[PDB]
Design a protein around this ligand. Structure first.
Ligand SMILES: OC[C@H]1O[C@@H](O[C@H]2[C@H](O)[C@@H](O)[C@H](O)O[C@@H]2CO)[C@H](O)[C@@H](O)[C@@H]1O
Ligand SMILES: OC[C@H]1O[C@@H](O)[C@H](O)[C@@H](O)[C@@H]1O
Length: 296
């Protein structure tokens, strides 16, 4: 692998993304704002060299939701290695639904979708998921995570609508609260015509070449999640992928599972909570040390 795109930091970093302002596709109680508004609301910026991207934790919400940002990269990649080093990620905050993921070109889910970092509410473990068109199942081996669903098809017969094929990390510091308590870590995602692999290196355990110019995933520890096998035409299920950063609220996942999890005691429903308790979302922010993409 050789470097092809270093996102840098601060404004140079944001220059490489488009700010999504449309209604939330996942129907969350969120108000995605433009770059200027976000900048004017302290939603984006730099923090001691780290790139900051958060949500409104000051004002009571109104309109379509609590303000946040959803960044989608201008550049796209189809084969390569995506390495993100985070000092902080949106916390395990009730009502929130953060995600660092990739989305293919064309109509979803035909171009494929890779959720590298995702979770909802007070989740402890991270979920790594693939969302694809029909005809793509993965094998159960080659990774340290716990396999939940093996059919990547968004409307797979035996799984919840759009659960996709998901693998749950076993390290409680792989997401939100625990992740932030150790100062974060690194998530490396490899896309090849033979499958996808995702490695999570908690702060201090990353290999010597992961942040360098010529990383070689071949000599690394077993990945946390691996999607491969003859049950999928890996090449055809995924096309050029663009990177996406976002934090939504409630909606199809977080909002739907609000009443059965540990947040049910915060309020009758997710929206009421997110609307009236701004101070609860102070931890809902990303803090990027670096974002680099490589190619074979
Ligand atoms: O992971 C199990 C969980 O899946 C939920 O569907 C989510 C999916 O997990 C997520 O990766 C994707 O981005 O959004 C879909 C739709 O919200 C499902 O709603 C849950 O019931 C299920 O427990
Ligand atoms: O934003 C990417 C896609 O995400 C999916 O979860 C939504 O259902 C689609 O409508 C949307 O196009």
């Amino acid at each position: 692998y050789h470097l092809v795109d270093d996102y840098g930091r601060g404004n140079g970093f944001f220059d490489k993304f488009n700010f999504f302002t449309g209604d939330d596709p996942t129907h969350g109680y969120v108000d995605y704002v433009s770059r200027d508004v976000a900048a004017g609301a302290g939603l984006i910026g730099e923090r001691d060299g780290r790139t900051y991207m958060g949500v409104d934790f000051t004002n009571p919400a109104s309109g379509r939701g609590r303000r946040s940002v959803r960044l989608e990269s201008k550049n796209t990649y189809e084969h390569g290695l995506i390495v993100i080093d985070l000092a902080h990620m949106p916390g395990s905050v009730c009502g929130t639904w953060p995600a660092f993921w990739t989305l293919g070109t064309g109509d979803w889910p035909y171009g494929g979708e890779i959720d590298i970092i995702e979770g909802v509410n007070d989740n402890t473990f991270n979920h790594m998921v693939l969302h694809t068109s029909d005809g793509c199942t993965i094998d159960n081996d080659g990774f340290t995570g716990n396999l939940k669903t093996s059919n990547c098809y968004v409307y797979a017969p035996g799984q919840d609508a759009n659960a996709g094929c998901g693998i749950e990390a076993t390290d409680p510091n792989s997401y939100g609260k625990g992740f932030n308590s150790i100062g974060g870590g690194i998530y490396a995602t490899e896309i090849t015509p033979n499958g996808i692999s995702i490695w999570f290196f908690p702060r201090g355990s990353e290999p010597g070449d992961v942040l360098g110019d010529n990383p070689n995933p071949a000599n690394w520890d077993t990945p946390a999640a691996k999607f491969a096998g003859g049950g999928c035409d890996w090449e055809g299920k995924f096309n050029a992928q663009r990177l996406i950063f976002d934090v939504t609220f409630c909606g199809d996942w977080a909002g739907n599972v609000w009443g059965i999890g540990g947040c049910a005691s915060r309020a009758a429903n997710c929206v009421d909570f997110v609307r009236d308790n701004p101070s609860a979302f102070a931890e809902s922010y990303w803090l990027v040390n670096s974002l680099r993409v490589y190619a074979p």
